[PDB]
Symmetry: D2
Subunit: 505 residues, 4 copies
Amino acid sequence: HPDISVDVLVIGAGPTGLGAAKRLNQIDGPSWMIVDSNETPGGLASTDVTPEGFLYDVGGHVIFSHYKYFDDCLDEALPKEDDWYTHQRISYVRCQGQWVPYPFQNNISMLPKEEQVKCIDGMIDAALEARVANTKPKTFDEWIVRMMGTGIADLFMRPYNFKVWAVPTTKMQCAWLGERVAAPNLKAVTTNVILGKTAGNWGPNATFRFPARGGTGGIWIAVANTLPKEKTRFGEKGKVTKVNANNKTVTLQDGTTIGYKKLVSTMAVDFLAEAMNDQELVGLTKQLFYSSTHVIGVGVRGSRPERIGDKCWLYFPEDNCPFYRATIFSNYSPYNQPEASAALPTMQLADGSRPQSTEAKEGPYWSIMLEVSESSMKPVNQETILADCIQGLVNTEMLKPTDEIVSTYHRRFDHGYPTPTLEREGTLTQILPKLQDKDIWSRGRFGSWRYEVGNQDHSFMLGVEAVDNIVNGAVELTLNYPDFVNGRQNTERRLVDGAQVFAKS
Amino acid sequence: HPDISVDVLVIGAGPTGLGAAKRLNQIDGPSWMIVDSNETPGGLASTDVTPEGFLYDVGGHVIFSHYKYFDDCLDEALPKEDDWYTHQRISYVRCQGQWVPYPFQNNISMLPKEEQVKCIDGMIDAALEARVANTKPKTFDEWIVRMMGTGIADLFMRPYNFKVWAVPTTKMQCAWLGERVAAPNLKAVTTNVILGKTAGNWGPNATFRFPARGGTGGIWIAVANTLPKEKTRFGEKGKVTKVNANNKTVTLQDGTTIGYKKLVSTMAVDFLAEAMNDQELVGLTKQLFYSSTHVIGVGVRGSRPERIGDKCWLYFPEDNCPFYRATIFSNYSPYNQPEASAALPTMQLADGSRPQSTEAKEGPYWSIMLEVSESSMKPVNQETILADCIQGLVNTEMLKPTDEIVSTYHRRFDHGYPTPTLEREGTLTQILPKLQDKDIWSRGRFGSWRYEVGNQDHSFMLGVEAVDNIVNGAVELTLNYPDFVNGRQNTERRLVDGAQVFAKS
Amino acid sequence: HPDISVDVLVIGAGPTGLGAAKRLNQIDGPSWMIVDSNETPGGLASTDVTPEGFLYDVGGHVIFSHYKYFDDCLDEALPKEDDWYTHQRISYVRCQGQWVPYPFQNNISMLPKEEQVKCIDGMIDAALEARVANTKPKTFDEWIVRMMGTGIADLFMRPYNFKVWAVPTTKMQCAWLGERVAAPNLKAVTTNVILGKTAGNWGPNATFRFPARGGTGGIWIAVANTLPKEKTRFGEKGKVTKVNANNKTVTLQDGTTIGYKKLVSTMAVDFLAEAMNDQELVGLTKQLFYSSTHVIGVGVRGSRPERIGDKCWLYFPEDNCPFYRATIFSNYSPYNQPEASAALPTMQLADGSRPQSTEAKEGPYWSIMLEVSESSMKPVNQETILADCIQGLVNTEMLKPTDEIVSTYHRRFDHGYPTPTLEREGTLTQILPKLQDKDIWSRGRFGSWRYEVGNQDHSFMLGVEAVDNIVNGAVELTLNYPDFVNGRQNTERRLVDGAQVFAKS
Amino acid sequence: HPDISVDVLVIGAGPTGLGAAKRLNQIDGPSWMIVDSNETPGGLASTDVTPEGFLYDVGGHVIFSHYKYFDDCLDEALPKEDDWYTHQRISYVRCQGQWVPYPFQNNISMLPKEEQVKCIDGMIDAALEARVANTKPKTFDEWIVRMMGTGIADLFMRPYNFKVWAVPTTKMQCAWLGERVAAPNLKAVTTNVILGKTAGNWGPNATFRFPARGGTGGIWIAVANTLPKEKTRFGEKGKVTKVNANNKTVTLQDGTTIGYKKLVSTMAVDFLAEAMNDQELVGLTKQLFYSSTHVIGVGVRGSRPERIGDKCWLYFPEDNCPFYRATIFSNYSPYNQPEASAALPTMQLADGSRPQSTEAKEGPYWSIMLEVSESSMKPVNQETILADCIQGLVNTEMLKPTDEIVSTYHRRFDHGYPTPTLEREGTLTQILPKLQDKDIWSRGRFGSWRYEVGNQDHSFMLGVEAVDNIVNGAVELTLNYPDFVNGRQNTERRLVDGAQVFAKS
């Protein structure tokens, strides 16, 4: 007999676990509890703060929701209008000294005419091939070329994607991209070239909302706060060290044992295999591939520069900087950095020099958040990456050499991106059903390892749907059919369903 | 206040309504009731019997299930191995004096050589066109010709489908057919021709099971018998005559009134609109097209003729008989007709002549069930159709002129097939959301009018998924995504889900 | 017995007859004679002069030679360097207020951007269609739109060709255009649009030579002059009125009879039929279609305007002028108009007004030569066409309203262009063999009626090859295989062949 | 001064040389002479005879004339109807125990059904690929596969062509095949398979004529006999040993010197270079490739067996015989072998054994002529090739083991086929113009090395057209445009041209 027994045990209190917990709490049938090794819930959707008062998410986090249920829970958690700021989804690609509006191909009018020719010629070849194609592309790289042609591929998507995924495009599958035909809109691209037109894919009806305070992490603290505390176990007291799948028992770091009938596990599935002492599963999970993420944060003195303006996130295919993406984090909330009246000494200039003066000066302040990927195919020198990033900011004209840096941040996250390699699906089909047969629902960004359903809303719903499968025999649509859930508005499932309305009568 | 109040009212106890009821009963949450104007549940999945003891379903009813939940309920209803008989899915196409195994194109070796040449030439054209196609077909007819080529299309699918739908193939949409590419398998067809091969699409793996007793109707009587009797009102006492959507009140023939919070309606949506006295909906529903079905049954003295054999159902593209489909119903169960020792006089010979003797003689007996369609584009003389069908059986060499007929059956069903016209969706997307805004779930073969999800299993699940949407916020997948439910094994939803397991503890 | 007998009689001393005569004269074998109704040889390659001293060819005549034999005779006829002027092949298309370098499609960057978009979109459609094309175009019109796409076709080739041929492009064949694939060079076209570039198809090596004196007509007088005078009969005395094909006799206007063994006839073949009093041939030949040509000449006071510059010939697709082509004939030779010291009074201003003064004033002068087509499908008012042309010159900004016109010319040529209609070949393959059966070689622009071998060099060579077929069994390649002779430089036949070298030895 | 001086010297009196001679003789202008090292004209179109009286051509020689001139000279040489026998062009392919009518692909209905399936599947792939093809094949092999698909290519064209050319198909060009599209007639091939039909490409209009006496060589002896004898020098006395291209002098084996103005050389161009002591030409001509031909003749006792019948020539793709082609030479003329009354002993039986009786016995006799190719890529054991051929006759069921062989013949011809390798043209366009610059016209099967114009008529006309180029500036059409001469009836040039008619008056 174990110290604790519940119907459904949830491991992990990032978005996926909290999703499971919210649905269990709403259903209010089977007993349950949720554990996490961290005292603060949120996982990779948490937020750090520097000693100088600059917040950083785990890299650029922008919410786009495909589900009403996720909306209900965020609304419940942060119900006030001033809990949120709304922004247009404004992004550019840095290329040859220019900020090119995303998506890159509709905007090549900004490049020299000789580059436009190369790009259009390439897209003409792709259009003519697509006209007679009768096989689907097999790799990300094939998909990219067929869609963009060679010239456009080489300027952006090819080099950018290696900088993000930390594996060559030729090593990745292309199903995760969805089911749209791999072929150019030659006319649209050419029409904008001819008219000398630029056009971003944002506007009044393409926005996101971002929490007013606490960064992205503020959301998950607040969602977790709506749960009954006695059913949570967050911190050292909730760290899982052993999972005995045959006994349906979990052991915590402090020796506590928890018996379950069903397990929803949201920790990285390779960690789960180890915790299970299951050598066959360990072997299989070791076949999966992932990249690590270095988040670098830079706090800067001054009112926001005109060159920066209302930019949100930015892409960097070029090799004059180590990061693949920069976020103007100070544009997301004025509470992501200190007030103007806060006094801070200059730590260094962007050119790397350090002033002798220790004088604390006032703001205002703005803030840049950078991401650098790492894998066994792309090493990162942790000791110089901060200074390399800062030099990169100078090379891309984001910072002037004389800009005053008042805060810095660097953190490496081991499991950053689950990689859609060619082998991923073959391996997952040997892993997930095996766990399933042991009444283990492994789900989440690393729980089930599928980037195309790896955002905050997807993750949350992987937990919600897992519980719905366990209790109500629901289909796990997000897990098995990402194109299905991503291609529609999912409005049917709500924080208050008919079951609760009828029961309250 | 109404005579009776329930959370969920279900109108109709055909498979769709019975699915809603089974799911409501299993969930055992919201209060509910189910009514039907008929004392015997089953709707179009019911079974009649002649005074001579010959059973007839409402035309050929062969079950292919896409859902475990449906299987669970059938097994619960009729759990004994001897409650069912199993048969291979054996079907042929009557063509030019030959029984051609289905699928037709894989078996044209039975046709004369010069005709094989014309068929293969047509399919080569279709194959060469498919290789460069850059558009999808827009009509059923275009889809047929792209798949088969002209010659093969003209022999079977074109004339057959007119005889089924009672509208030309050029007036129907083709999304209902699913997402497969409209293109020929030229190598499959030529290979069988070169080898002189015939092959049907059946074998030990491709089977169906049929109720031992009571015909298809027997299934639904048994399923209904699992419901709590007190929550059903079947018969004149259960005939709905009025629906007041604004007050959420239903009024029955005998004046009883029922209040509901949510309505699941499975009667034909055009009747529903009439009962709502909603003139706008009456107008829209009159825009829907449907065909009526004449069912003709013929009971025949004699052991099963060799030429008939193990045949199950049969297609008739040709002009020498009015029916589009025949079923050897006596092959489905030995209890679909009287035992050999039962004595019956001969009513007539197949060529229409009087028998030599008027006395009762013994069997054994076999049985043929026929289908003739009717619409505004295809009238049917009810006065002569029985005789025309019988002459058709002689014409197609199903009966010899000498065969002795000991029973006949004819019945017209007004709502037979909901037609996938080009106009169908345009009309339905105006009807269903208006009903939905009134908390009315109109669902079923004519409740929602979509043939591609119009079988017994689809119908049952339309009711189940409607309840699940109402109670648990489930997606109505069968209703909105026919290709999705038909392309997969739906195993998640069970008659005993977690909710019930956890509650029982 | 006839007044004269020769082995080979040549009717007509345009380039074609002169070709036959030149080759007969070189071979110096069979006896021969050449006749023409005009005292001056040259036919449609002759030159008129106005009373004011302005020369006009029969519309734009620019030589491009496919044969060394043709080159040899021109060099013999006019052997001095200063007998000729060399110019680049400079041409433009007048469109929407612009002079657009030929070829039109490589220069649409001069048009408004919105129009550029339409043109490129059309040619994209054309390129994608050509990629899967499995049939050849059957009409001139289909060829055009497949090469250019709709938008580009509509701007130039379609409306221009109707103005030229005086029949719609849908009524003409396309074999005469040669064997190039009807598909666009999409990359060349979009590249120039992207680069904002213009480029004509001329340069230091794309040139023509034009005679220093006497216009094109000067070539043929000089060539004719190299023949033995006593073998020529030019003028009223040389006019053929009757051809008796059965007696192999010809009767001239003055009553003289000529007997022949072989006839090379270069008069229009419809005229030949009438002269033969052959009703079958008369019937067939009037099934052939042709347009008449109006040549309009305008002599203008002043040095060459900058806007005109080095332009040679110009195309006019648009409806603001009646002519289809203009030639800056003063650019071809300084001797095509009077010298600057020559004094001439102004006849009218370009806007039609009277000059201030009637006095004779000095030059210099420049000169424009225009062509207007006429057919039963496109009537021409002979009484207003000159004035309409002059207004057309103002509309197209070739002349200012104030420009001083000092000379005018207008002449109508009945047989101008033999039309490549869809029916042409069907008719010619009935006519030519009947004539051939009577030992009549009917050859030339209207002798054999094929425009694609209808220039000066072709015509000449048609005569040469006819003689070579008659004497030496040579293949009539220019006549039967336009694509052959046009796709190579024909170098083998020379004015001095082995035969004459060995003979003189 | 040289011993003899002529305007035009012809080296070689095979068909090419004789063509030149015949045209020079007709033109009767320049002086000329023709020399040959063999006393009997004919070259590779000569005929040998065994000591037993069996004639053998140099392999199968079947005339198909593209030219009226060639016909004229054959008619003049052998004017009587009894000088020729006419036959249909009957040929078959030996394949898996059967005689398949040519063309192979239209007759695969003869093969086992499973094999027909593989053949049709392969041709289906070829048809679909051809539908979207936009590049031409670059090798003989690519051409074959695109026309036939893999299955069919592998059964006949691939192995047969290696047996013929003695180089792999992947090493040969495909321009020599003409300009017909490389694509299958899928309908014709499947139609014959469906109807179970066979059909040869012969009939009453597909015929050839063969000389009644003296074999093919009889033609050329008779053609040579029409020449003025004093202008010929045939035999050891006419053997060219030295060519001094700079002095325009030729030296014969007996020391005689001949000066020329123009040289028509028909000897193999590699031999010409050596005789010129031109080291550069030697190096170039050594880059050409050729195969040798072994001719094996077999004289057989007996009347023609039924299994042989009216067969003319036969193809052998398979490994069970070393020859690629057999000719039933005794079907071509009754005078190709001894009369029945001729008494000859049996030399061996077809199984290789000694006959029982060594007595001379009577006929009738029939006769088989075989061809085996050899090259550096395909060596042949010359010592055993006769016996291997005879065993091959047994293996292919052409001879019974007991058949009695009364005569054998074997001869190797070093220069047999000029090979259309990928390199051929790059080499020839360096060779032929360099010879042309020296007033040397090198022409013929090995004179100009183009197999596609390498038959008797082609060769003859290469000689004629060379002369016509030299004297009348004619285009050398056969030499430079094989597709042109092969695609039409060349009727213009006759043995009596206009030149001769006019001169005789």
